[PDB]
Coordinates of C-alpha atoms in Angstrom, one line a residue:
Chain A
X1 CA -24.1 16.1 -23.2
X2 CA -26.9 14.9 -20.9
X3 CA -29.8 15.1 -23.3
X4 CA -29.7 12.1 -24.5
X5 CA -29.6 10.3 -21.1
X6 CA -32.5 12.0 -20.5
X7 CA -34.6 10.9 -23.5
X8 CA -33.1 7.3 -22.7
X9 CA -34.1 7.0 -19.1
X10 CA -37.4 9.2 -19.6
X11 CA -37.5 6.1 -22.0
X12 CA -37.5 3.7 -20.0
X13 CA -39.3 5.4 -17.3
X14 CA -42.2 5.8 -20.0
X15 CA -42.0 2.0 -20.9
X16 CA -43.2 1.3 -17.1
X17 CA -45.8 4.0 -16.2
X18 CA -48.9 2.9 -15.5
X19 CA -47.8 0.1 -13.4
X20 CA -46.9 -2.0 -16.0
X21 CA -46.0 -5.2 -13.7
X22 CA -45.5 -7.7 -16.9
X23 CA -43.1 -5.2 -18.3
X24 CA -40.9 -4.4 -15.7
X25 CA -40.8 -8.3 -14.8
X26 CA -39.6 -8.1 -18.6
X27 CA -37.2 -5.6 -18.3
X28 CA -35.7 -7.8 -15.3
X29 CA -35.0 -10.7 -17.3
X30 CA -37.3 -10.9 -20.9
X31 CA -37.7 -14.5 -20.4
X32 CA -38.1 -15.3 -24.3
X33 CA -35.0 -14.2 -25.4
X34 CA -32.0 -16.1 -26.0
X35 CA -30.1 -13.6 -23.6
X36 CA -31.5 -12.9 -20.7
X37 CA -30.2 -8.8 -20.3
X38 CA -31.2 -7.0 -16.6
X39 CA -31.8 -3.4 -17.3
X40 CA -32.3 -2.3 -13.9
X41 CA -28.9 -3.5 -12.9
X42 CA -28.0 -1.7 -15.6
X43 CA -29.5 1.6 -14.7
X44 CA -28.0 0.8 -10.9
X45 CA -24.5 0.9 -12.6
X46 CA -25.0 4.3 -14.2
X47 CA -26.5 5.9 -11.6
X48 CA -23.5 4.6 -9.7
X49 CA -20.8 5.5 -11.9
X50 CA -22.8 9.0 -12.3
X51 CA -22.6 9.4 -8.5
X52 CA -19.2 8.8 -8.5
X53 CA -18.4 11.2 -11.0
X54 CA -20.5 13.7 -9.0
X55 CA -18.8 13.2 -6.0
X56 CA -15.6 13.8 -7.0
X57 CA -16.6 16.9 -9.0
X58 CA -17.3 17.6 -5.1
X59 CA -14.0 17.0 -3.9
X60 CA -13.1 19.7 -7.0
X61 CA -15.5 21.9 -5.0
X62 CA -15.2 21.0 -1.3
X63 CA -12.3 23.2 -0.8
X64 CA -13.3 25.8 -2.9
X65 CA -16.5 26.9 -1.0
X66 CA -17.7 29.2 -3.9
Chain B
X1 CA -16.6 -10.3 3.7
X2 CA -16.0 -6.6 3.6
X3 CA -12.4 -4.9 4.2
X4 CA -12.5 -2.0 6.4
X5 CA -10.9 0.6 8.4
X6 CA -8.9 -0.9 11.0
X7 CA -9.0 -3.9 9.1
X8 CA -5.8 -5.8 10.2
X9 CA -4.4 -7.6 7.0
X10 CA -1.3 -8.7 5.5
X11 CA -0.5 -8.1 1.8
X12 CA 0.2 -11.8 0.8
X13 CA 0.6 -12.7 -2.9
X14 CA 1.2 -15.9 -5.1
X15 CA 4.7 -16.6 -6.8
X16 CA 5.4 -20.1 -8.4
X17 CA 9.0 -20.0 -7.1
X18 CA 10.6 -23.7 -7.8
X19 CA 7.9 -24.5 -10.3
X20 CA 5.1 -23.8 -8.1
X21 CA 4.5 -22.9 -5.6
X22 CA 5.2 -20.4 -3.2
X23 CA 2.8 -17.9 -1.7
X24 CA 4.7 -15.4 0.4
X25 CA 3.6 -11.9 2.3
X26 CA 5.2 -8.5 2.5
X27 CA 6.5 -8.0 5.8
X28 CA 8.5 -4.9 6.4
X29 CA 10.5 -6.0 10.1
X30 CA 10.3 -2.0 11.0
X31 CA 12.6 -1.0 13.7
X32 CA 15.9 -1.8 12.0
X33 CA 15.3 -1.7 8.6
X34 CA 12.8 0.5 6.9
X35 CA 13.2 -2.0 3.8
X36 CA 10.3 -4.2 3.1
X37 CA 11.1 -8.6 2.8
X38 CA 9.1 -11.0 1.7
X39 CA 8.6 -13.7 3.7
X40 CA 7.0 -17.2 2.4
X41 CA 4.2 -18.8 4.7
X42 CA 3.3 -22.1 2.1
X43 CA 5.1 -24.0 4.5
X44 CA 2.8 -23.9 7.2
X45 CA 3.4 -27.3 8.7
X46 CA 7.1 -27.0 8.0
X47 CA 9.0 -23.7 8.7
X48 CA 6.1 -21.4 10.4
X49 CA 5.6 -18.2 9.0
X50 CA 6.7 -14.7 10.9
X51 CA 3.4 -13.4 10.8
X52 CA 4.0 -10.9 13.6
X53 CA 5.5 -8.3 11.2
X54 CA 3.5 -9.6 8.4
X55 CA 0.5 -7.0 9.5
X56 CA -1.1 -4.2 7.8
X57 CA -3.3 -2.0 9.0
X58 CA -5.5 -0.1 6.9
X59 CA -5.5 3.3 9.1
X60 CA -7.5 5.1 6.8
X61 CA -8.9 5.0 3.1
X62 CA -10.2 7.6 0.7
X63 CA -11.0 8.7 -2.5
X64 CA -8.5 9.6 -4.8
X65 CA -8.9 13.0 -4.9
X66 CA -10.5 13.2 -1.2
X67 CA -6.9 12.5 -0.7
X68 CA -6.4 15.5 -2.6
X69 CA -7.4 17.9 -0.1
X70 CA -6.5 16.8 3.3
X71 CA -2.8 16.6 2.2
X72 CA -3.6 20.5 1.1
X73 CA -4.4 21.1 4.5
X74 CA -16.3 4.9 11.4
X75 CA -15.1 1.8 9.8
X76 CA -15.8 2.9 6.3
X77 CA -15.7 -0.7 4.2
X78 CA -12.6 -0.2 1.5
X79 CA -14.0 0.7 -1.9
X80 CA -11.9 -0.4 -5.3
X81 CA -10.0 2.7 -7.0
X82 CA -9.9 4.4 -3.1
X83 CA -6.4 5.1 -2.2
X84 CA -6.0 3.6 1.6
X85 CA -3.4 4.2 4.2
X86 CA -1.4 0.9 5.1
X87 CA 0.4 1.1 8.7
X88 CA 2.5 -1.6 9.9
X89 CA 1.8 -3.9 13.0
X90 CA 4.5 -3.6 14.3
X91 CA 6.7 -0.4 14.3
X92 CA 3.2 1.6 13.4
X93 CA 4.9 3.3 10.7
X94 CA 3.1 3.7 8.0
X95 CA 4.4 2.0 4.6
X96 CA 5.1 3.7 1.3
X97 CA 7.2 3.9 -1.6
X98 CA 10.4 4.9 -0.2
X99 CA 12.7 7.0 -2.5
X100 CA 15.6 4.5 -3.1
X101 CA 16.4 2.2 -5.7
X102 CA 18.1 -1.1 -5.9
X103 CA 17.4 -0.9 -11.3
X104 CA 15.3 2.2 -11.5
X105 CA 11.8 1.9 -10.0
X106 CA 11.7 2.9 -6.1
X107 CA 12.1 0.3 -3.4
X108 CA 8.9 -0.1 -1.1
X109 CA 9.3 0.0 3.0
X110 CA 8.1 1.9 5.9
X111 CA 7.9 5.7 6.5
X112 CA 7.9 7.4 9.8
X113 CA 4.7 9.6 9.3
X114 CA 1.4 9.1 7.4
X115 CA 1.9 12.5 5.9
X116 CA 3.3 12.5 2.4
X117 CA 1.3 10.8 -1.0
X118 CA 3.9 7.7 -0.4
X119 CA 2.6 6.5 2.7
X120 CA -1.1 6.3 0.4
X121 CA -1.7 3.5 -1.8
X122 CA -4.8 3.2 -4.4
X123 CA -6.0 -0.3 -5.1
X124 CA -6.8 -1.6 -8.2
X125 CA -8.6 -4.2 -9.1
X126 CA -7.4 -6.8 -11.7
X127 CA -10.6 -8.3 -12.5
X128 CA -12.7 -7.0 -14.7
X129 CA -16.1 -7.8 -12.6
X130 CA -15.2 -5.7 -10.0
X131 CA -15.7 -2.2 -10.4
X132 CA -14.2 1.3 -9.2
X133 CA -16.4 1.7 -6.2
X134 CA -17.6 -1.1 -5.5
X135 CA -16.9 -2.7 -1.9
X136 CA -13.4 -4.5 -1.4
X137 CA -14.0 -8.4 -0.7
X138 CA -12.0 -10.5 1.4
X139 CA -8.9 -12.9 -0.3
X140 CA -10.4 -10.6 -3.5
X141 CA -6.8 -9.9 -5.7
X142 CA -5.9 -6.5 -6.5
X143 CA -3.1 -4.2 -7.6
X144 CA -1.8 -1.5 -5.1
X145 CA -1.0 1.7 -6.6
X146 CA 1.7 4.0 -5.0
X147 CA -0.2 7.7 -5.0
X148 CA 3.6 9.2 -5.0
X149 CA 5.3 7.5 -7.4
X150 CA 2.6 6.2 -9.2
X151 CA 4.1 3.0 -9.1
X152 CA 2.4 -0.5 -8.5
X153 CA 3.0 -2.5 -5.2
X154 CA 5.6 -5.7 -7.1
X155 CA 7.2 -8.3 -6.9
X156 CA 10.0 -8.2 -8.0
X157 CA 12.2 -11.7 -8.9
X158 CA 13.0 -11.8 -5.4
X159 CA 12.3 -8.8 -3.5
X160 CA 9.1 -6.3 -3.5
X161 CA 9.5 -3.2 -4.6
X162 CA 7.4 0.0 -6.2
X163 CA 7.1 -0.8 -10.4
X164 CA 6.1 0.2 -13.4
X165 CA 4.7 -3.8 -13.8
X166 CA 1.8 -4.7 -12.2
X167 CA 1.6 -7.4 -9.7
X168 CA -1.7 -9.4 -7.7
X169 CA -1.4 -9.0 -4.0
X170 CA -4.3 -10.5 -1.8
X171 CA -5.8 -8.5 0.8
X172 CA -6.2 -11.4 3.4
X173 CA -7.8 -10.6 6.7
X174 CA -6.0 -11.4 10.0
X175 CA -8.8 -9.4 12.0
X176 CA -12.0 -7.3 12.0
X177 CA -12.8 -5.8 14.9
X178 CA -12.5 -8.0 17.7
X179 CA -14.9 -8.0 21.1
X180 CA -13.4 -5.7 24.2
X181 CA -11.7 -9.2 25.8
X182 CA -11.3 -12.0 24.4
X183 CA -8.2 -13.6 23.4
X184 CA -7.0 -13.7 19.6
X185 CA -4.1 -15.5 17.9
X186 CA -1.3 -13.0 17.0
X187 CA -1.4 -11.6 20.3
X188 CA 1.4 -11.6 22.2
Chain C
X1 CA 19.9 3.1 -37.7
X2 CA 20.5 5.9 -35.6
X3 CA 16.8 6.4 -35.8
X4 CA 16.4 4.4 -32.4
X5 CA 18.9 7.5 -30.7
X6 CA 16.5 9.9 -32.3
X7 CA 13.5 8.1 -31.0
X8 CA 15.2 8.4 -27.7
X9 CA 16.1 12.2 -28.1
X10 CA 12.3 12.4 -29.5
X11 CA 11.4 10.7 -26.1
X12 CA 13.2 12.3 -23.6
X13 CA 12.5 15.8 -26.0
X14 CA 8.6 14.5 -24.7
X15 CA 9.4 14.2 -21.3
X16 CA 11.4 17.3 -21.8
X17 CA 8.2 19.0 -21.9
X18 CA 6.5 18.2 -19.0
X19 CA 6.8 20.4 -15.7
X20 CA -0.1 18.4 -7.8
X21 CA 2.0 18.0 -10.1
X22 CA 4.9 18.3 -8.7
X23 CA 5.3 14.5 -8.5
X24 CA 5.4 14.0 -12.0
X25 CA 8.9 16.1 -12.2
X26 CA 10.1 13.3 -10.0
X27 CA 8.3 10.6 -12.2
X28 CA 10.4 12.6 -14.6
X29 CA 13.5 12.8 -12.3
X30 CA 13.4 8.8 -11.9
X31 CA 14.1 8.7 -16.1
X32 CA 20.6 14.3 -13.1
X33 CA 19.9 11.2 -15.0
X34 CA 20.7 12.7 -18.2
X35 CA 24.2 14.3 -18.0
X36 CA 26.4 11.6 -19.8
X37 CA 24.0 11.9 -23.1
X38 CA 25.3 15.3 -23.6
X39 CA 28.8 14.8 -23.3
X40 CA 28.5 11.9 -25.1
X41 CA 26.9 13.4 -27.7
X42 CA 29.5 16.0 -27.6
X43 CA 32.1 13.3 -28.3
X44 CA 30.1 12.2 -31.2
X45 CA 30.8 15.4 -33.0
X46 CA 23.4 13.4 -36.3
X47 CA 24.1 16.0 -33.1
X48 CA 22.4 18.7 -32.8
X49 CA 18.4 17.5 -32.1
X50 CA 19.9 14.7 -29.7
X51 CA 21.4 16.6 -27.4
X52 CA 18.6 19.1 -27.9
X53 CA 16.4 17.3 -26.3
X54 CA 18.4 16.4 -23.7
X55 CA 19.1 20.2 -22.3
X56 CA 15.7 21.0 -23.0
X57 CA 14.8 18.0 -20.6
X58 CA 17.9 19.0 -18.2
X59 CA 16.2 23.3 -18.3
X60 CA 13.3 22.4 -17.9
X61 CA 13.4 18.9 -15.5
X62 CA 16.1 20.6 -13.5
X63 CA 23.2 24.6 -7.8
X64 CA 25.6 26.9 -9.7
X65 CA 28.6 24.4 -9.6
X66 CA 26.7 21.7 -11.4
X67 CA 26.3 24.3 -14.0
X68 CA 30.1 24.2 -14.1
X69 CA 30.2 21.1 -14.5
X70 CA 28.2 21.5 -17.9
X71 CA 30.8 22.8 -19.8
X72 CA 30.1 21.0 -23.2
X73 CA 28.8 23.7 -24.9
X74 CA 32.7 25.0 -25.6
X75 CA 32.3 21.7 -27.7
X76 CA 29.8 23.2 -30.0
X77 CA 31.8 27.3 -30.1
X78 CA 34.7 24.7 -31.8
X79 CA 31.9 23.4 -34.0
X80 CA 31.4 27.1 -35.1
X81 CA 34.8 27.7 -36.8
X82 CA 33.8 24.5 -38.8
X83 CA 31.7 26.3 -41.0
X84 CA 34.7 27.9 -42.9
X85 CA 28.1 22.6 -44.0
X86 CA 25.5 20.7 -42.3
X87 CA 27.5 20.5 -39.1
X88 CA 26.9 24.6 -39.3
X89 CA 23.5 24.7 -39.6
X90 CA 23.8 22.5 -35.7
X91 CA 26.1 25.6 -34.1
X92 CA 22.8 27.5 -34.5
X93 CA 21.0 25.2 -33.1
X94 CA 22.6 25.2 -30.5
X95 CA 22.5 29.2 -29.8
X96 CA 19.1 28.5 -28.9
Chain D
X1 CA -2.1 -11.4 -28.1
X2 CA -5.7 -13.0 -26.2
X3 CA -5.2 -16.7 -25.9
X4 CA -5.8 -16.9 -22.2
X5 CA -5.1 -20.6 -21.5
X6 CA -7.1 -22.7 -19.4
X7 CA -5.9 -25.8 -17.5
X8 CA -6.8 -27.9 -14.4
X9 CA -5.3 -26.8 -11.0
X10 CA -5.2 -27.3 -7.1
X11 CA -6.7 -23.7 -6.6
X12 CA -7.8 -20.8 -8.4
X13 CA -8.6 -16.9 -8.4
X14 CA -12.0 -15.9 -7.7
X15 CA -13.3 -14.7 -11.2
X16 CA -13.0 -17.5 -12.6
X17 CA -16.5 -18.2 -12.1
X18 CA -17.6 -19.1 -15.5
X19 CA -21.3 -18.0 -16.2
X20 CA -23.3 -20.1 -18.5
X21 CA -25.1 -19.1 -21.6
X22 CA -27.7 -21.0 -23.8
X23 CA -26.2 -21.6 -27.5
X24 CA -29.4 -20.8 -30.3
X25 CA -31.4 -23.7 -31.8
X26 CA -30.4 -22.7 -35.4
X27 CA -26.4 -22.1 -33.8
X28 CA -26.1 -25.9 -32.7
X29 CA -27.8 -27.1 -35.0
X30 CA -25.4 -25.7 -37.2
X31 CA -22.6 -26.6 -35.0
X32 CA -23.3 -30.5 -35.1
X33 CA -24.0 -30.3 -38.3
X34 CA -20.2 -29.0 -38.5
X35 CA -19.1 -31.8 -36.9
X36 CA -21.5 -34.4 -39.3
X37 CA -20.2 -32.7 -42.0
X38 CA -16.5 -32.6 -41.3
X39 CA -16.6 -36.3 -40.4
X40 CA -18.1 -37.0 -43.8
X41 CA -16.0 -35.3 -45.9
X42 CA -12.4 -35.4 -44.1
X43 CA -13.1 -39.2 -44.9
X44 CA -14.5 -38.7 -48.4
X45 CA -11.0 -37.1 -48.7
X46 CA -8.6 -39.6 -47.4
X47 CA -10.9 -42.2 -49.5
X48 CA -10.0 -39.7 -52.6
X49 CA -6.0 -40.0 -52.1
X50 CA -6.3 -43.7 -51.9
X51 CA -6.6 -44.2 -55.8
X52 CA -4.4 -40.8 -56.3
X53 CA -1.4 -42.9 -56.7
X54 CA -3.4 -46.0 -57.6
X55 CA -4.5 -46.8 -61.1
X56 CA -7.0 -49.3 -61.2
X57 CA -15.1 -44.4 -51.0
X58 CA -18.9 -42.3 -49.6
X59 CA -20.8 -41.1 -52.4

């Protein structure tokens, strides 16, 4: 159920539009936290896993043709 | 740092054999005996080791299920969770998890043809910080995975052989893909 | 008790249900391998579910003179005439 | 069980890279103040069996 992926990364799409340079440097590292947390790398690691699923549900379809 | 396609390597892994240590590799001698024997190199300056049958080559490597297609029917850097081909040095068969038993999970040697799920082997990593997909690193440690008998690559205390336990085996390079010319060491 | 033998029989009853994947009959296979639990549990004449399971695992995991050798069901038609019992109510399981 | 057990050796498999991470003020503060406060008391206890068996110590 993809909906919610889509309200979370429209979320954090909508946290940076407009160029916001101090907040992406903040979603890199947030330097005045305790815990220093890198969304992007994040976000790297689900579009990742997210390709993999998807191209594997290929190889469910490569033979198939239609 | 990355493992590839045509990546000569030998399968060594640790074992604390007489309190440790003893690092040994897998080293199947082919033409004579399709059974796989480990074969200890800690020695080094003492009893050298017989690296010459020691090689692996890693012929090909795919996705699980990319396997699952071409059995139905470019270096590419190995990727964790792919299942890869392994192919002997030597004898050029290809090794797999051979249907035999020595007391009930399969002993591991060479098969004739790369046809066949055996001859495949997906690799697992142990660690937790690498990740299904993510590019295979020299001296890195990982579990093999027969795609036959869906039995690890073990060791057995000893003798290898296909298990239901799980064992480390490091992926160490021998060599890349060495300039037209140009001596190497493990040529003959 | 002989709780652990019907854990076993529940077990191999598990694994007697289970038939791409072709290579899980011989994941199955390497668990025929069976054989001795029936006749065993023939000679134990409690019965009935144990050996169930293991000739629901033997149909459906696994030629005609091996089928021969499987005879022993002759075990259980003894069994029947020891109704004239709870040893009864096991004939009939074996029917099926 | 999870009791991985750590001690010294000649070599060593590669994630055992061990990534540090800052403690909070209020955490160590607390966490010396376990120690101050251990060390006072384990004493103030030993001082408290000494008279236990002898009819006649921090305060």
């Amino acid at each position: 159920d993809d909906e919610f992926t889509q309200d979370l990364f429209r979320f954090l799409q909508l946290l940076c539009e407009g160029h916001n340079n101090d907040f992406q440097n903040y979603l890199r590292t947030q330097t005045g936290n305790t815990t220093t947390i890198n969304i992007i790398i994040c976000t790297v690691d689900y579009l990742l896993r997210l390709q993999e699923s998807i191209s594997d549900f290929y190889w469910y379809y490569s033979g198939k043709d239609v | 740092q990355f493992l590839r396609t045509d990546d000569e390597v030998v399968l060594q892994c640790s074992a604390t054999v007489l309190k440790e240590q003893l690092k040994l590799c897998l080293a199947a001698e082919g033409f004579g005996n399709r059974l796989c024997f480990l074969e200890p190199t800690s020695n080094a300056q003492n009893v050298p080791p017989d690296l010459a049958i020691c090689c692996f080559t890693l012929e090909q490597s795919l996705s699980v299920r990319a396997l699952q297609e071409m059995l139905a029917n470019g270096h590419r850097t190995l990727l964790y969770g792919h299942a890869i081909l392994l192919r002997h040095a030597h004898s050029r068969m290809y090794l797999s998890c051979l249907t035999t038993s020595r007391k009930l999970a399969f002993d591991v040697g060479l098969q004739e043809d790369a046809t066949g799920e055996a001859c495949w082997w997906t690799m697992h990593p142990a660690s937790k910080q690498r990740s299904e997909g993510e590019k295979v690193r020299v001296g890195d440690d990982l579990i093999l995975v027969s795609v036959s008998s869906e039995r690890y690559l073990h060791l057995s205390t000893l003798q290898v052989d296909a298990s239901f336990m799980q064992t480390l085996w490091n992926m160490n390079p021998i060599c890349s893909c060495c300039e037209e010319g140009y001596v190497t060491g493990g040529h003959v | 008790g002989h709780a652990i033998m019907s854990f076993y029989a529940a077990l191999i009853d598990l694994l007697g249900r289970c038939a791409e994947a072709l290579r899980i009959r011989a994941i199955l296979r390497s668990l025929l391998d069976d054989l001795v639990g029936i006749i065993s549990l023939p000679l134990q004449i409690f019965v009935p579910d144990h050996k169930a399971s293991m000739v629901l695992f033997l149909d459906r995991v696994y030629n005609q003179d091996f089928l021969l050798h499987v005879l022993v069901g002759f075990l259980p038609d003894m069994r029947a005439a020891a109704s004239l019992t709870e040893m009864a109510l096991a004939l009939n399981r074996y029917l099926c | 069980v999870l009791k991985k057990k750590a001690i010294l050796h000649q070599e060593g498999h590669m994630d055992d890279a061990l990534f540090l991470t800052r403690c909070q003020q209020e955490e160590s503060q607390a966490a010396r103040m376990i120690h101050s406060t251990a060390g006072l008391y384990n004493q103030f206890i030993k001082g408290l069996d000494s008279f236990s068996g002898k009819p006649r110590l921090p305060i």
